[PDB]
Amino acid sequence: GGLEGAERNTREMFRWTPAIISPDQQIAQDGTLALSRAQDIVQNDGYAFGAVAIHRDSVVGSQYKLNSKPNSLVLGAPEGWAEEFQEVVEARFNMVAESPENWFDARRMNTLTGLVRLAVGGFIMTGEVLASCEWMKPNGTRMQRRPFGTAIQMISPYRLSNPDNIMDDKYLRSGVKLDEMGAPIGYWLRKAFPGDPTDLEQWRWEYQPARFDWGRRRMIHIIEALLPGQTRGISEMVAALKQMKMTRNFQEVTLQNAIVNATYAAAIESELPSDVVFNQMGMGQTPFGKNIAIDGAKIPHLFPGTKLKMQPAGTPGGVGTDYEESLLRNIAASLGLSYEQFSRDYTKTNYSSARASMAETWKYMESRKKLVADRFASMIYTLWLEEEVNAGNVPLPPGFTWRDFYDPMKRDALCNAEWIGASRGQIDEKKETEAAILRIKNGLSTYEAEIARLGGDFREVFKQRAREEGIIKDLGLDF
């Protein structure tokens, strides 16, 4: 051959013979070991926990608001219906979405924003979002009333497994039931976490269809595939688990080394007995104007042949140097982060380098957002919207009926949504704001687009400004 890196004739490559292996078989063999190792590292390494928090906060942030994008042209509806639908749905949805009642969570502990945060954080940690679209009976007794029935239960990927540990097949890959095309049609879920001694049911599986008798989702599965034909998610951490673990071992053994070196503040080499030597150094000496009482500035007298070697605490190397910076860079590269975010070290930043790292990392996080968090929350929104449409709590477009919601086009037209996370981050308020103002005033952008960059949707902002101007006017304030 002529390709140097694709041959074994080379001393550097003779031993590198990786196996031809399917991604699904990588997951089947490695699988739970990667999940457990990633969870371990996240739960025992501060940098990884922080990275998870950074993913949560950059992708989603403090809020995850709905902006509804009804595709009027597919629906043929007039430009003037859409604004009413947007108003009504955004109000009704965001109200219960941000509500502390946790309506959307079957466990009633996470707000929608919190559900999305949990998904994203698990994604980097597990490689996939796995959730069930439970149903909690609405219009029940007053003590258990609900505005809507749909609820989400986020599932541990450990529970997704082939029933009774059978080997995988063309139509069954690590717990996923596949059609002939490879499309997931249903998932095999252990009724409880594996190995959990508190639940006897963990011995058993249940099969949950991805789609109901109609295309309504009963299960939510999301991955960002690396290889063609991959159907189970492999976490980004897997590329770095070795580096993360060995970096942690390095940090800890370095810290132990430092401590050990600092404890032995001195050493005597003496042929005297210990009781004499330490008495020379202040043992048993009372402090006044086998533990030595420090009082101050002693001058010991040591017989010749007794050597007092003082061993002051040196600076332990490696950690805090460019080396450990490089390790953390290698990791953050897999986690999609900038060294500054991952390591919390901005010592060597400047306005341009900070801005460049922000641009790269924002590209990555906007990708994760629009391809994991937006899909997840949109799967939730389409369910809530199915409920409201069948109930007629929303303004249907001319000629529409809740039965048309089964038409993929007419459905995706309404369920189309854009999601406003927190503000995008703003390293320089003055300059970036003037840029946005320029882009608006010169037509290069919408208010909706910029105000979303600022963490809001433009219409409530304009309503609030209307209220503020009415208040200002009747007060007579000349601003």
- Binding to a second copy (CB under 8 A) within 63-92 occurs at 63, 71, 73-74, 79, 83, 87-88, 91-92
Angstrom distance (rounded) from CA 169 to CA 346: 50
C-beta of 350: minimal distance to a second copy in Å? 6
User: Per-residue x/- marks for a second copy, 322-341, CB under 8 A?
Assistant: xxxxxx-xxxxxxxxxxxxx
Chain CA centroid to CA 29, Å:
25
Do residues 424 and 453 make contact, with C-beta atoms less than 8 angstroms apart?
yes
Angstrom distance (rounded) from CA 278 to CA 284: 9
User: Per-residue x/- marks for a second copy, 33-62, CB under 8 A?
Assistant: xxxxx-xx-xxxxxxxxx-xxx-xxx--xx
Q: Select the residue interacting with a second copy from 78, 259, 391, 401 (CB under 8 A).
A: 259
SS3 for 257?
Answer: helix
For Cα atoms 271, 275, 278, give the angle at the middle one, nearest 5 degrees. Answer: 90
Q: Which amino acid is at 54?
A: I
Chain residues 443-462 in contact with a second copy, contact rule CB under 8 A: 443-451, 454, 456, 458-459, 461-462
DSSP 270-331: -SS-HHHHHHHHTBTPPP----B---S-------TT-EEEE---PPP-STTSHHHHHHHHHH
Quick one: tokens of 209? 């269809």
Q: Select the residue interacting with a second copy from 14, 78, 99, 399 (CB under 8 A).
A: 99
**Region from 220-228, 384-392, 394-402 binding a second copy, contact rule CB under 8 A:** 220-228
Of the pair 181, 398, the CB lying nearest a second copy is at 181
Quick one: tokens of 257? 């080394």
DSSP lists the bridge partners of residue 184 as 178
With CA atoms as reference, report the closest residue to 116 among 98, 93, 134, 101.
Answer: 98
Chain residues 174-213 in contact with a second copy, contact rule CB under 8 A: 181-184, 192-199, 211-213
Q: Select the residue interacting with a second copy from 78, 140, 284, 300 (CB under 8 A).
A: 300
**Region from 269-277, 383-391, 394-402 binding a second copy, contact rule CB under 8 A:** 269-277
Chain residues 234-253 in contact with a second copy, contact rule CB under 8 A: 234, 236-243, 245-247, 249-253
The packing angle between helices 46-59 and 32-44, to 10°, is: 100
C-beta of 17: minimal distance to a second copy in Å? 8
Does residue 218 touch a second copy according to CB under 8 A? Answer: no
**Region from 214-222, 384-392, 394-402 binding a second copy, contact rule CB under 8 A:** 214-222
Q: Select the residue interacting with a second copy from 140, 204, 226, 390 (CB under 8 A).
A: 226
With CA atoms as reference, report the closest residue to 337 among 368, 311, 303, 316.
Answer: 368
Of the pair 398, 476, the CB lying nearest a second copy is at 476
C-beta of 329: minimal distance to a second copy in Å? 5
Q: Select the residue interacting with a second copy from 207, 284, 321, 401 (CB under 8 A).
A: 321
C-beta of 450: minimal distance to a second copy in Å? 6
Sign of CA dihedral 322, 326, 331, 335: positive
CA distances from 394 to 68, 93, 232, 456 (A): 13, 11, 37, 22
C-beta of 442: minimal distance to a second copy in Å? 5
C-beta of 206: minimal distance to a second copy in Å? 13
Q: Select the residue interacting with a second copy from 26, 67, 68, 162 (CB under 8 A).
A: 26
Q: How many residues bind a second copy (CB under 8 A)?
A: 295
Do residues 192 and 185 make contact, with C-beta atoms less than 8 angstroms apart?
no
User: Per-residue x/- marks for a second copy, 118-157, CB under 8 A?
Assistant: x--xx-------x---x-x-----xx-xxx---x-xxxx-
Do residues 133 and 383 make contact, with C-beta atoms less than 8 angstroms apart?
yes
Q: Select the residue interacting with a second copy from 137, 165, 287, 301 (CB under 8 A).
A: 301
Chain residues 368-427 in contact with a second copy, contact rule CB under 8 A: 369-371, 374-375, 378-379, 382, 406-409, 412-413, 415-416, 422, 425-427
**Region from 383-391, 394-402, 428-436 binding a second copy, contact rule CB under 8 A:** 428-436
C-beta of 173: minimal distance to a second copy in Å? 8
DSSP 8-state symbol, 468: H
C-beta of 133: minimal distance to a second copy in Å? 12
DSSP 8-state symbol, 398: T
Do residues 151 and 105 make contact, with C-beta atoms less than 8 angstroms apart?
yes
Chain CA centroid to CA 311, Å:
46
SS3 for 178?
Answer: strand
Of the pair 204, 465, the CB lying nearest a second copy is at 465
C-beta of 436: minimal distance to a second copy in Å? 7
Contacts of 402 (CB under 8 A, 6+ apart): 389, 390, 392, 396
With CA atoms as reference, report the closest residue to 23 among 193, 242, 258, 232.
Answer: 232
